[PDB]
Amino acid sequence: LAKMAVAESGMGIVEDKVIKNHFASEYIYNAYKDEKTCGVLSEDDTFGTI
Amino acid sequence: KRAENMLWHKLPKSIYFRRGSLPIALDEVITDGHKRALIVTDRFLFNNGY
Numbered sequence: 001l002a003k004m005a006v007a008e009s010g011m012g013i014v015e016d017k018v019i020k021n022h023f024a025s026e027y028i029y030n031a032y033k034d035e036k037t038c039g040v041l042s043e044d045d046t047f048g049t050i
Numbered sequence: 051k052r053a054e055n056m057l058w059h060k061l062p063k064s065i066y067f068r069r070g071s072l073p074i075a076l077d078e079v080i081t082d083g084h085k086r087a088l089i090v091t092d093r094f095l096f097n098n099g100y
Contacts, residue, residue: 046070 002017043050066075079087091100 046073048070 001021002014005017006012006014040050064078
């Protein structure tokens, strides 16, 4: 994917789009690895909020 | 002549009560400047999240 974006646009270094495509796929996975986004996020029993 | 013994009606300064007024009453002792608290519980109430 880094070699196609320099063959298409011709405005970058091919070695720098490697660690930018790597940042966008394993650092985005690592920060949001276990983050509740689908079901019940929080729940309070003393105040009664879900 | 006969006189009667002085009676009284002595209570705590605040008797807070409803269904879920534990954290709303605990916010009063926060705003009174209390910074160090000791909690005396039973052995069952500590092992069950009370």
